[PDB]
Symmetry: D2
């Protein structure tokens, strides 16, 4: 079927004072809403190019399909990886994978904060699992669909676009990145990590 | 463990006259082994950047880790996707999936040849499975790592970087992506389809 | 010598009510001065890689000098393409060139508003003169240095990164872009087209 | 007027043995003519999109104009910076410029060969002059149009695309880039630098 906007499982002002309800609102409502309309739209123009047998604008069509489909895919996962009752540290299988992988929790976290505040332009920090070589790696994604390999399973994303922190942190991106840690919903990530390794 | 170079399950000349045994051996033995060696070396300086706690070149190691891991993941699925004994059409569930998603294998095929031949630079054509929307969509990747959403599971790719056809097709890439079709191991696509929707 | 921050020919409050005074003071004071600092550091590090003969981080020093010199080149010409007493329409020579190059001032204005509001990530709309075909064309810039040819001389630029409008027009990109037209200082655009075509 | 494929000031084989005549010929006559047709067609779809007042596909028309116009300005300067009677060193002002900006002609050259051999995908190395701070600097361009600032004057470039050397050096691009130094035509570079500094 068509893609659609998921609802949040918290009220827009729930991450205050770490992330304002003004931002969650424009973000879920303006920003993600337009990526889901863009995704359904690129889907429908390729169905028509498929019937008129005219692949003359293939390049804008495959570029509009990857851009909206990926902004909706990262957005969808960023709402479930944040929680009002979040913070602290991961536990169980996940916390042991993370120290085995980056040596230690605080080390994984100095690299994740280093990959998210050095993007030149918009992009995000993403923790993913590579099934080719079964490892847990951190990637710096540019924009919404570039800089990582195909088939990588996404587990915890930090949105670096300016719309995610300009109305409250203005240009101090590092303090928005420090505040994200107090709202991480580690239960969602742990659950992502287990279906990833099954 | 370490990423390593897979062996093909055919002799390099096996694919002739569709793809000359000299490209199969410069592609596999030279281009792929360099991605496998660049992916183990980007995993190793992130390891030492974590130990000295020096994240000053984090933009370079995250960039060297996606380019080479993407080049290694995409050549490893191109060698299984190609076989001396393939060609023809998909069968079963995979062939009804295609027909149902693109209308017919013939319309699936003309869109895949448009996206593989209209790339501006190095890139490939990719048939993948989207888990969010449960759809079989094609994408146009630029280089090895860009232009598709995280988590898409790849099932059929066609390498259009110059090195996969210059020696025998010179500048005529269209001719190569038409030959391609005669050596597709649809049993390998069939198998990846079945596991992506398991 | 070293690169430095240009002063403005007007007080941050001067383009009110079209672009706020906070936005220009953060833009100039925070954003632009960082770029000016990072191009002087990309310069210093290549001098240092050249003295010790080690160019193992070339990909990186080549990307940071282009990201930061681009950004400082783009912002230094944005403070000049604007003005309290600006607005209206181009006069003289530039006018005719405009009307000749794009059919009309109103049709140049519609081609530049659409390339400005359709960028997928950060970017700007820029009017430039091509000295090889001696044509005035409008390009869509990705980030601060992508998507135009080497050697284009830049004449009027519209900053579309979110931080240039966020705090005041929120995700309403479209109203920052039309309000722009009432503060463009056409005298500075006419003098740079005159020197580029001398 | 329209853009057109310039004439080489030499015959295809005059570069032997440093770069084969078969490359120079499919390079000029197939790759370069394709970007000139493409630049020509992109400028016309904008004329046609500006008269029917329909900017639906502005992203593809501005991307097809920067891609193909950038490849035509790059190849047009590549046939002139190469020559059968070149090689050796720069002389005069160019050379004291080059040694005071990169330490010595031997250090500018190790830096340029570094930037042309680690590109990740298609690309070129180019030395250009920055008008803002008046300095010679080398850049690593991605594709034909990304990675440098607007307004930099190009002076010398080395095409790292595969099609520039795969048929004679195969994957050994560090060799192709070593042989280039015997074909550089320094009277051209030094003449583009005296006009750039005027
Ligand atoms: Mn976002
Ligand atoms: Mn390849
Ligand atoms: Mn800006
Ligand atoms: Mn070329």
């Amino acid at each position: 079927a068509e893609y659609t906007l998921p609802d949040l499982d918290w009220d827009y002002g729930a991450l205050e004072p770490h992330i304002s309800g003004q931002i969650n609102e424009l973000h879920h409502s303006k920003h993600h809403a337009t990526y889901v309309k863009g995704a359904n739209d690129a889907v429908a123009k390729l169905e028509e190019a498929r019937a008129k047998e005219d692949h003359s604008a293939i390049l804008l069509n495959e570029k509009n399909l990857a851009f909206n489909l990926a902004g909706h895919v990262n957005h969808t996962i960023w709402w479930k990886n944040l929680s009002p009752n979040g913070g602290d540290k991961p536990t169980g299988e996940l916390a042991a994978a993370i120290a085995d992988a980056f040596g230690s929790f605080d080390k994984f976290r100095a690299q994740f904060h280093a990959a998210a505040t050095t993007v030149q332009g918009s992009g995000w920090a993403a923790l993913g699992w590579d099934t080719l070589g079964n490892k847990l790696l951190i990637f710096q994604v540019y924009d919404e669909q570039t800089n990582f390999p195909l088939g990588i399973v996404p587990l915890l994303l930090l949105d670096m676009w300016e719309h995610a922190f300009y109305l409250q942190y203005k240009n101090v991106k590092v303090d928005f990145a420090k505040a994200f840690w107090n709202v991480v919903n580690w239960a969602d990530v742990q659950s992502r990590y287990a279906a990833a390794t099954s």
